[PDB]
Amino acid sequence: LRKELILSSNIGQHDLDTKTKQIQQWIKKKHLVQITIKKDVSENEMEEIFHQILQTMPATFSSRPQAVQGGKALMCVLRALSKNEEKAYKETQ
Amino acid sequence: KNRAARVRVSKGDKPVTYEEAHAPHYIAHRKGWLSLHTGNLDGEDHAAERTVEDVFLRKFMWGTFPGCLADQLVLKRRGNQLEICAVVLRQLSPHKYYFLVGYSETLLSYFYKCPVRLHLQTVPSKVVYKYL
Amino acid sequence: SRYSPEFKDPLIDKEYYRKPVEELTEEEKYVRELKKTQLIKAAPAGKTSSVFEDPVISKFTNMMMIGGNKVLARSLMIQTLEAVKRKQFEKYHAASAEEQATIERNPYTIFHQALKNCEPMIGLVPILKGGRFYQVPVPLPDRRRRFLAMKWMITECRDKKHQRTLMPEKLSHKLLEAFHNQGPVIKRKHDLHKMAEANRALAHYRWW
RNA sequence: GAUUAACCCAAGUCAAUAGAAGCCGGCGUAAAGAGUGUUUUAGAUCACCCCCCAAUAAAGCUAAAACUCACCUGAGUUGUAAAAAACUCAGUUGACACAAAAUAGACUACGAAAGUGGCUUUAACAUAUCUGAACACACAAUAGCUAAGACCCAAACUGGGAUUAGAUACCCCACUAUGCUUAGCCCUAAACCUCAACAGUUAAUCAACAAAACUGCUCGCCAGAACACUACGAGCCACAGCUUAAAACUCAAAGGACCUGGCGGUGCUUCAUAUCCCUCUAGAGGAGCCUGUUCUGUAAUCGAUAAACCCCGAUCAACCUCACCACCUCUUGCUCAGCCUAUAUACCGCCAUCUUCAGCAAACCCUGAUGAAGGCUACAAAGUAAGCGCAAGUACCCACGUAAAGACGUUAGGUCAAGGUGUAGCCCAUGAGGUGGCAAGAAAUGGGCUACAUUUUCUACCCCAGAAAAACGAUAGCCCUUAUGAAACUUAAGGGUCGAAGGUGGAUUUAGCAGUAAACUGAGAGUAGAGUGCUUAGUUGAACAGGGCCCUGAAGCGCGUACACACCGCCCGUCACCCUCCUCAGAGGAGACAAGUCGUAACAUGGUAAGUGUACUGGAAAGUGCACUUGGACGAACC
Ligand SMILES: [K+]
Ligand SMILES: [Mg+2]
Ligand SMILES: [Mg+2]
Ligand SMILES: [Mg+2]
Ligand SMILES: [Mg+2]
Ligand SMILES: [Mg+2]
Ligand SMILES: [Mg+2]
Ligand SMILES: [Mg+2]
Ligand SMILES: [Mg+2]
Ligand SMILES: [Mg+2]
Ligand SMILES: [Mg+2]
Ligand SMILES: [Mg+2]
Ligand SMILES: [Mg+2]
Ligand SMILES: [Mg+2]
Ligand SMILES: [Mg+2]
Ligand SMILES: [Mg+2]
Ligand SMILES: [Mg+2]
Ligand SMILES: [Mg+2]
Ligand SMILES: [Mg+2]
Ligand SMILES: [Mg+2]
Ligand SMILES: [Mg+2]
Ligand SMILES: [Mg+2]
Ligand SMILES: [Mg+2]
Ligand SMILES: [Mg+2]
Ligand SMILES: [Mg+2]
Ligand SMILES: [Mg+2]
Ligand SMILES: [Mg+2]
Ligand SMILES: [Mg+2]
Ligand SMILES: [Mg+2]
Ligand SMILES: [Mg+2]
Ligand SMILES: [Mg+2]
């Protein structure tokens, strides 16, 4: 299932943590998490939000961050690491 | 809303004349033309010259008879004679009326190179067609 | 409408105006006396007392019209009628005397019967109960039925499937098919009826 | 702030602080009648005058419907707005509870209150005077804890299925604590009829609303809001609890009831007449082109920019127009200067807008206790109204229709660049003049023209024809000529050259009710020339016009309202943003200040009605379960 989230570049840390926990729940549930981030802010600054969100789950980018909405927003897709990918993570760990 | 030469209604304490009481669309239906000349007919010439002359005449008479005109002037043109029929208020002295009539007639005759007559009609106070 | 409400539509029937005065009921005599003192519109340029006048064909020509080209539309209609009659005459002559009894050659009759066959009995109308519209089957008035028949015929003719085929031939062929209860128009009517029957379960959604 | 003047007191004035004025007022909604009942001490004069229905405890019983089990029959059952999930259990008949008690009840009784509505029986419903507990005793729905049983059904939490941006909810399924019985605890409710007990009156009423106003007596309670159903102290079988309950910091309000307006994912009724939906016709949304705009670019205007902008100011830009940019030049300057410099949120002027409306109304009168406010009923009940608008009248071809007209106001709606104009600003320049130059397309989007053809295309003709038909299809591009002009690759027309995209177009959307839509043909405005634009004359000339109310809306009558900058409103909570105070070993709590982050919990039926108590759960408001309240409604003859 596709679970979608919409965020702002000026989202507070408490809201960000809450939505991070929600995304973790979805990933554990094995859902595709489509995250969109909208706006001054740089697109790299926005993509840092994706870095942090996936940092909290050392989940993987099924689709990498991409500019959308006329380039105003970024969008990405996260997925639960397959069994083989998780085994690779364990080995590298 | 249309504002063209319309006297907007008020508390009923605003006197107005027959000319002012009627919006533009009534022209030729309830009120005639304040200037009569052939310039605007089919195929005639010098419409602009006639109009400029009319405008200057109106401004000139207004400034020459300050606070004396009661209603708008009536310009008429017959051949080359120009006739300004005006309605004024019985306040200024008749001596000054006669002086200004002579002066206006002479100056306008010389300025527009055509005989000019001024026909004054004196009234006690501005005719109040209605109160708006 | 330049005509004031007082004006009434003219009636064009020589038989009606020549009906004997004795045959008139009280109400009919009253109607005539009232019309004696009523305002009547001018006779429209589309109809006349011509014995050959056909209102159905007049309406069909009007529906076929494109951009006020009454001349072209009427020309197409007469060409269609002539083509139908010629086809029927050819079939009649080429056919045996036994089946010549059934072979019909009146183009007007063929046209009327084809339209009547194509008329769809039950339509699908949107009906809204509780805020949601559904395509409920519903009876149709005769006016709507005739109009739908004519419109389906004309649209089928206008389709681009028949390329480089003149409208007279297209319409004559389709009219003959409909008369013999075949062809895309009859297929469409049956499809509408089939959809209505499939949606029969929603009939109660109607309130009128 | 300075200055001028004025005012008050005056050898004083008045900044700060302190004090002086503190109870016979109230308790339905503003704080206040404490959840209920009974004393002693006392108080009062209201003391002598003067059967039954649904209380409660115990014991017993069961009609309907469940569950389970038996039969046999079937492959489906449950689930809703639609589904998924869930079970192979489903139907008939029969047997069968420690669960809950249709109809009666349209009754209004019992009890002190909580509560009590299946049946029978036993016991039983205190006081011949009324008040009387934070000062004790006995009770106190639902929830909840303790220990043991029952468990049909329902059900917090939990799990699953949906829905969702998310869904810790609303919807569906399963199941647990729990609801039940026993013995203890707990002692809280919007425990509200928010209206204390007793006795009495209906007379001169009475802020508002609500359930009319009061008198006497008594007890309890109240004294701005919030901090605060809080901290501390105290008591308690209570251990995240209950009762009592402050203070500090902070504010000038908080609050109760109404009137008007707006608003309602507000109710009923009736409508929309090219109109909101279906229905008819023709279109746009798909291709090219013309053109406007937004963006990009440039040294290179400005204004409109939701309806009500977008072939708009312009009935028009090669120079000019021109207000733009670059450079150069002039300074009492065409002007008793000048400024297209800012302010349409100072204006006049002319307008859009509802308005495809019909109301606006001065001056009076009355009603409300003489409050904001309101003013209708025709078998008429407080309205009368001058004037404005509609209407009438008028142009066009009728008395039809189209025009015109369309008030008060709404959007601080447009225009300081038509012109003027207040204020502010420039004056060796933000003024004036001269030369040159920009005005393009990455690309999106609006309107129109051309087409996609066979009802077509070319030719003749203006309607009895002949050919074409993969060709149809540019007004696009390139080359040439011509018209105007001083200047033409860039403006227009004609010709040649090329025959391009395209094959009737998605959701969505425009216009039209008849000589209209549609198609076609002219003319005019403005220019030297210039539009597929604009105005307008004319030809041919249609189909539907019948149903409805989801949405748009309109009206009427109502309902609610925490909104009044009027829902684009208000407002809650978390998180982090700084100070004051309090509790605290540092951390919490409150308040204030104050812009954010995530939602939209509350105010409208606030989109799941709101809330009280209690329990579990959750970023967060909050969700759900049980009972209780209306401080919600159910549209108030029958339908
Ligand atoms: K199109
Ligand atoms: Mg107008
Ligand atoms: Mg209160
Ligand atoms: Mg007592
Ligand atoms: Mg007590
Ligand atoms: Mg209890
Ligand atoms: Mg249980
Ligand atoms: Mg109660
Ligand atoms: Mg409490
Ligand atoms: Mg406490
Ligand atoms: Mg304590
Ligand atoms: Mg329409
Ligand atoms: Mg397009
Ligand atoms: Mg502009
Ligand atoms: Mg602008
Ligand atoms: Mg120049
Ligand atoms: Mg220029
Ligand atoms: Mg300038
Ligand atoms: Mg304005
Ligand atoms: Mg009128
Ligand atoms: Mg008009
Ligand atoms: Mg404005
Ligand atoms: Mg503006
Ligand atoms: Mg300048
Ligand atoms: Mg060409
Ligand atoms: Mg030349
Ligand atoms: Mg060709
Ligand atoms: Mg809500
Ligand atoms: Mg709600
Ligand atoms: Mg609740
Ligand atoms: Mg829950």
Side-chain angles (χ1 to χ4, degrees):
Chain A
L1 292 174
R2 196 177 204 75
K3 289 291 185 187
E4 315 168 7
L5 279 171
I6 302 167
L7 316 177
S8 298
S9 306
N10 50 334
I11 186 168
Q13 200 59 19
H14 181 70
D15 310 299
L16 190 56
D17 301 357
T18 301
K19 299 193 170 179
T20 301
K21 296 170 184 186
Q22 169 168 231
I23 293 162
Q24 291 171 4
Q25 289 189 339
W26 289 339
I27 294 290
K28 293 176 184 178
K29 284 197 168 188
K30 306 291 189 169
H31 302 153
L32 291 175
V33 188
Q34 191 190 269
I35 309 174
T36 294
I37 303 180
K38 313 191 175 178
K39 297 180 177 294
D40 177 16
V41 60
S42 180
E43 293 201 3
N44 296 325
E45 188 168 11
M46 299 198 287
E47 187 173 350
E48 188 188 342
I49 293 167
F50 298 130
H51 293 88
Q52 293 157 349
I53 294 160
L54 200 62
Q55 198 155 359
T56 62
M57 297 176 291
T60 191
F61 282 100
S62 179
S63 312
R64 289 202 62 73
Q66 186 166 355
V68 299
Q69 207 178 76
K72 298 183 288 177
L74 291 183
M75 183 277 288
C76 70
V77 186
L78 310 178
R79 61 167 189 173
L81 286 164
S82 176
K83 303 176 178 189
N84 293 330
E85 306 167 322
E86 185 179 67
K87 290 178 182 183
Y89 168 80
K90 290 165 170 175
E91 183 173 343
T92 57
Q93 189 182 3
Chain B
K1 292 193 291 186
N2 298 324
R3 313 281 301 187
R6 287 166 169 74
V7 171
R8 316 305 289 157
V9 65
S10 170
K11 274 72 72 171
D13 55 302
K14 181 176 172 63
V16 304
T17 72
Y18 192 85
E19 289 294 322
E20 308 159 58
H22 283 76
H25 57 269
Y26 286 114
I27 288 161
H29 300 259
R30 284 169 205 208
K31 55 188 298 204
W33 288 281
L34 290 170
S35 68
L36 278 183
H37 57 93
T38 64
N40 283 316
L41 284 155
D42 179 69
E44 303 303 334
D45 279 337
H46 314 313
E49 275 74 351
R50 293 302 88 68
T51 314
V52 171
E53 300 151 4
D54 301 7
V55 172
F56 175 82
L57 283 162
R58 282 176 203 293
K59 286 187 176 72
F60 175 98
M61 277 296 284
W62 188 265
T64 305
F65 297 74
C68 294
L69 308 184
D71 301 4
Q72 291 278 303
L73 302 162
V74 180
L75 306 179
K76 291 158 176 305
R77 276 191 190 79
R78 276 194 306 288
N80 81 327
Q81 306 166 245
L82 176 74
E83 303 79 358
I84 315 184
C85 318
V87 181
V88 300
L89 299 163
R90 299 173 184 176
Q91 287 185 7
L92 194 61
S93 66
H95 286 101
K96 293 163 193 214
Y97 290 162
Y98 272 93
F99 171 96
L100 286 171
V101 160
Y103 152 75
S104 300
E105 283 173 13
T106 299
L107 191 70
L108 292 175
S109 307
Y110 273 86
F111 189 57
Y112 281 133
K113 316 302 178 190
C114 60
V116 173
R117 291 216 310 287
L118 176 47
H119 296 108
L120 299 192
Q121 191 184 133
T122 73
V123 288
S125 52
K126 185 172 76 68
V127 187
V128 170
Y129 175 59
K130 70 196 315 196
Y131 280 100
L132 285 190
Chain C
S1 183
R2 301 311 307 282
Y3 281 119
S4 86
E6 305 153 4
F7 279 82
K8 320 297 184 193
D9 307 76
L11 173 53
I12 296 163
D13 183 74
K14 281 164 67 177
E15 300 83 4
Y16 177 77
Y17 286 104
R18 273 99 174 94
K19 167 164 190 206
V21 65
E22 290 74 1
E23 295 184 3
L24 314 170
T25 308
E26 300 200 11
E27 48 258 38
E28 310 183 310
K29 305 158 76 67
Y30 181 47
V31 163
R32 291 168 146 72
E33 208 58 24
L34 178 59
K35 289 190 79 174
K36 281 177 75 67
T37 182
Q38 263 166 349
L39 293 180
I40 311 298
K41 301 183 195 178
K47 295 286 289 311
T48 68
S49 54
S50 187
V51 301
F52 312 117
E53 204 84 64
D54 181 4
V56 187
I57 285 167
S58 307
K59 210 73 179 186
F60 199 91
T61 312
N62 291 341
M63 280 178 67
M64 198 189 299
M65 172 185 293
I66 289 171
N69 199 354
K70 179 65 70 69
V71 167
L72 176 60
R74 185 92 171 86
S75 187
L76 300 165
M77 187 68 251
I78 58 167
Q79 286 177 63
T80 294
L81 290 171
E82 170 171 353
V84 167
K85 203 167 80 174
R86 285 196 195 295
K87 284 205 205 77
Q88 282 305 112
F89 268 66
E90 196 61 57
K91 212 172 56 171
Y92 184 107
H93 277 182
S96 55
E98 294 71 14
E99 63 202 355
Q100 281 175 17
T102 48
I103 284 161
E104 175 48 34
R105 289 176 297 177
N106 187 316
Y108 298 97
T109 287
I110 292 145
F111 180 80
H112 286 319
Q113 185 56 68
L115 287 190
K116 263 198 270 160
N117 298 348
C118 294
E119 290 193 10
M121 304 307 178
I122 193 175
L124 282 166
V125 67
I127 310 186
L128 184 142
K129 273 210 184 308
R132 305 187 175 288
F133 64 91
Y134 277 117
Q135 292 313 89
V136 187
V138 59
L140 299 168
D142 299 309
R143 270 198 330 288
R144 180 66 182 174
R145 287 207 298 270
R146 292 178 287 184
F147 171 87
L148 274 170
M150 300 174 125
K151 185 169 170 186
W152 287 351
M153 195 75 78
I154 295 167
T155 310
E156 180 67 30
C157 280
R158 285 178 185 166
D159 68 355
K160 295 205 188 304
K161 298 300 293 292
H162 288 41
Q163 287 98 19
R164 283 193 68 167
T165 300
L166 298 179
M167 182 82 182
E169 283 67 0
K170 283 181 293 210
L171 186 60
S172 57
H173 165 78
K174 299 295 176 202
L175 270 167
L176 291 164
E177 270 168 354
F179 179 66
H180 299 130
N181 295 298
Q182 300 299 324
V185 185
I186 296 284
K187 176 58 67 67
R188 183 173 180 178
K189 188 198 78 175
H190 295 170
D191 278 5
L192 183 90
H193 280 180
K194 276 155 191 148
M195 188 178 272
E197 191 270 2
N199 302 358
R200 73 199 315 278
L202 295 76
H204 63 298
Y205 286 13
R206 174 159 42 110
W207 57 74
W208 68 89

